[PDB]
Design a protein around this ligand. Sequence first.
Ligand SMILES: [Mg+2]
Ligand SMILES: [Mg+2]
Ligand SMILES: [Mg+2]
Ligand SMILES: [Mg+2]
Ligand SMILES: [Mg+2]
Ligand SMILES: [Mg+2]
Ligand SMILES: [Mg+2]
Ligand SMILES: [Mg+2]
Ligand SMILES: [Mg+2]
Length: 62
Amino acid sequence: MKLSEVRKQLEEARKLSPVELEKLVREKKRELMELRFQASIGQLSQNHKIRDLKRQIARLLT
RNA sequence: AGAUGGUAAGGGCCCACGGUGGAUGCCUCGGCACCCGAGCCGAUGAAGGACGUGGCUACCUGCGAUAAGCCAGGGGGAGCCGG
Ligand SMILES: [Mg+2]
Ligand SMILES: [Mg+2]
Ligand SMILES: [Mg+2]
Ligand SMILES: [Mg+2]
Ligand SMILES: [Mg+2]
Ligand SMILES: [Mg+2]
Ligand SMILES: [Mg+2]
Ligand SMILES: [Mg+2]
Ligand SMILES: [Mg+2]
């Protein structure tokens, strides 16, 4: 289900849009990094948070 | 004075039961032949690779830093996150 919702809202990134396709992505990635840091230290990650993010970004990157 | 009897360190044949070995039978996801179909790919970067890519990933597979994946259309109708 996660699809429909986000992607629609994602061309909804059209106030500023490619500029925001971008801005958003950047923010999305910092999250991934923050997230896989938590990931590696162990005592701060529960998995799919990762996958789900990476794929936000593949979609975002569209 | 005399006579021919038991011994088995070990060995031989026979039976029995094991070990080892992987023949025989059955099996088959593979192979072989024929026939039909189909028959080009590439600078819009092929064929084929290297290195990567999974929360934990050695390999195989898939994929390409959007990395076992992204979008859309079609199919399908309870399961799914490969081996
Ligand atoms: Mg005598
Ligand atoms: Mg004897
Ligand atoms: Mg003896
Ligand atoms: Mg015995
Ligand atoms: Mg890795
Ligand atoms: Mg990882
Ligand atoms: Mg790993
Ligand atoms: Mg591989
Ligand atoms: Mg890219």
